[PDB]
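User: We ran a pulldown and think these components assemble together. Before we commit to crystallization trials, I'd like a predicted model of the whole complex to look at. Sequences follow.
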Amino acid sequence: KLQDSLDAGVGNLVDADLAKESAKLQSLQTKQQLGVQALSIANQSSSSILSLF
Amino acid sequence: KLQDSLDAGVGNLVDADLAKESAKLQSLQTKQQLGVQALSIANQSSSSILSLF
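Assistant: Here's a predicted model for the assembly, 106 residues in total across the polymer chains.
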């Protein structure tokens, strides 16, 4: 019983809960796709100079 | 981040505003054509004396 309680305490000490991570993964994947879109929009800005000439 | 800030500072230090140059260039082209035509009209001062003789 002592070894059981000790392993349970180590598991509380270290193990992460995954139900939070199913949310965190979705949020960061969506934010990454928005970041690539924002980076494309930022890269495109230089094209306007050519219209002036 | 610090190298990005230093590069942005150099860019503010030396970059030209091309939208200003788009106006300044056409203004100088028109002024140059006016200067050439003015020099052409000034060249003909010798023409008037032929009528006197």
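Chain B touches chain A through four residues (CB under 8 Å). That may be worth checking against your pulldown data before setting up trials.

User: Thanks, that helps.
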